[PDB]
């Protein structure tokens, strides 16, 4: 396997994001006060912008991808046409333990929790075989496929960039929460206009998959898709946050939807509205 992707750094304030349905209930016009794992309001969320060059002037740079998994994350990419393709949540990313391999090609999602040989820089190679020959992916992410359990092979996770009307499309948000032997993944794809950085708005999230597997996941890093020509100049926009145990008051709407919330802790004003 090859090591080629490098990552830059930045910081930004996640104004108000991460509120999600804790469970499926039709609670309508209900001021619930659920306490669970959430993303703190106005928290400093990083802005990883993984960048790749075709390969020349190696200029001694060390690799430096690495990411922790304290509680849950808030991977909230913004990129338009699918390049972010999946995540490799694990604890050692070696032949010793288990690790998820969420992979989202054009027609399926391939969650394949398994002892993998993830090397220092995984990535999906989409290579051109013939003049057209459709599109084919391969394996530089893993090289072992050791003893492990079954897959999940569901409908594609990220949608197929429905962008006909000419806008800067969905702010893809996911909240990967691991608890009590379950993997809970939520999703939401609220569209945005040209220049956005997760504006105001208390938009909620919906559960997508509740994976029954239970692991000691403590680290992760997202899989990019490099279009083979040596590969073309890739790019990405990570938005890895970090969840904290916070108490929220959720302001459910008429049609069971969530439209407003408050963290009860940012300000004494917020606390007073939290205790009513």
């Amino acid at each position, epitope marked *: 396997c090859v090591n080629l992707i490098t990552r830059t750094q930045s910081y930004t304030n996640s104004f108000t994001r991460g509120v999600y349905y804790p469970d499926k209930v039709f609670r309508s016009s209900v001021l619930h006060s659920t306490q669970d794992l959430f993303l703190p309001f106005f928290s400093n969320v990083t802005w990883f912008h993984a960048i790749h060059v075709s390969g020349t*002037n190696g200029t001694k740079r*060390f690799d430096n991808p690495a990411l922790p998994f304290n509680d849950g994350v808030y991977f909230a990419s913004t990129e338009k046409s699918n390049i972010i393709r999946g995540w490799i949540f694990g604890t050692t990313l070696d032949s010793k333990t288990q690790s998820l391999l969420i992979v989202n090609n054009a027609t399926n999602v391939v969650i394949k929790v398994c002892e993998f040989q993830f090397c220092n820089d995984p990535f999906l190679d989409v290579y051109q075989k013939n003049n057209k020959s459709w599109m084919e992916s391969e394996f530089r992410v893993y090289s072992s496929a050791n003893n492990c359990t079954f897959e999940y092979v569901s409908q594609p996770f990220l949608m197929d960039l429905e962008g006909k009307e000419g806008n800067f499309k969905n702010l893809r948000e996911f909240v990967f929460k691991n608890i009590d032997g379950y993997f809970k993944i939520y999703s939401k794809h609220t569209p945005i206009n040209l220049e956005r950085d997760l504006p105001q708005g208390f938009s909620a999230l919906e559960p997508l998959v509740d994976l029954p597997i239970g692991i000691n996941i403590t680290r992760f890093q997202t899989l990019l898709a490099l279009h083979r020509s040596g590969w073309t100049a890739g790019a990405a926009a990570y938005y890895v946050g970090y969840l904290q145990p916070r108490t929220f008051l959720l302001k459910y709407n008429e049609n069971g939807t969530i439209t407003d919330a408050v963290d009860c802790a940012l300000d004494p004003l917020s606390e007073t509205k939290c205790t009513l």
Partner: antibody
Amino acid sequence: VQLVQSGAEVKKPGASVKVSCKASGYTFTSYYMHWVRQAPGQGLEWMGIINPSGGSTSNAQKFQGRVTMTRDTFTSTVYMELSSLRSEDTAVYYCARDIARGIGEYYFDYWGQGTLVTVSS
Amino acid sequence: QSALTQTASVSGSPGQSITISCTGTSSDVGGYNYVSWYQQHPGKAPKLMIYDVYKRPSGVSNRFSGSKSGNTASLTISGLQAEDEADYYCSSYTTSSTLLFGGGTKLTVLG
């Protein structure tokens, strides 16, 4: 995948030395190639990188500009050079390769062969 | 610089499991999570034994296990046989754009 360097070389103090290492068994341009030093019986030291794809020719601040490493892909060799050596180094030199395809992380293996550049009055 | 300085010499017994330490600037080890533990067999070229904190390469018999807490690193050699009298060297990428090699740990065993 075994590497090879030049033979033992000797120079008087205050002179130049030009050592060479040749790669084999893999794609020379893909992998990095480092240079290291250690006085006889003393701790190791690391020079820099000669990434064959494009001359990076890095070095530590201690040797900044003193060492001028050059690549050669056609012969699959690495050329590493000194300047103004007066009994300071007189050490054993190893051409180093790192465990990485493409952009590299400084974890060394396949430490060449080993050459004893010797300088003394 | 040579900020990473470890034990000058350590001793052990056959069967015992002695740990050698890597000490240097806490920025170098605390800031970045890269350490290396190249062995040095006397009279010939060194070689790697664990390329990351706890990631072993091929052909090391799974006898060496790494650790890290702020400015700590070790191999935890299992048996400490007679062949392990070879010198040991630590190294880690720096906060600055350079690589520092430790010097010392001339391990000794009974005999």
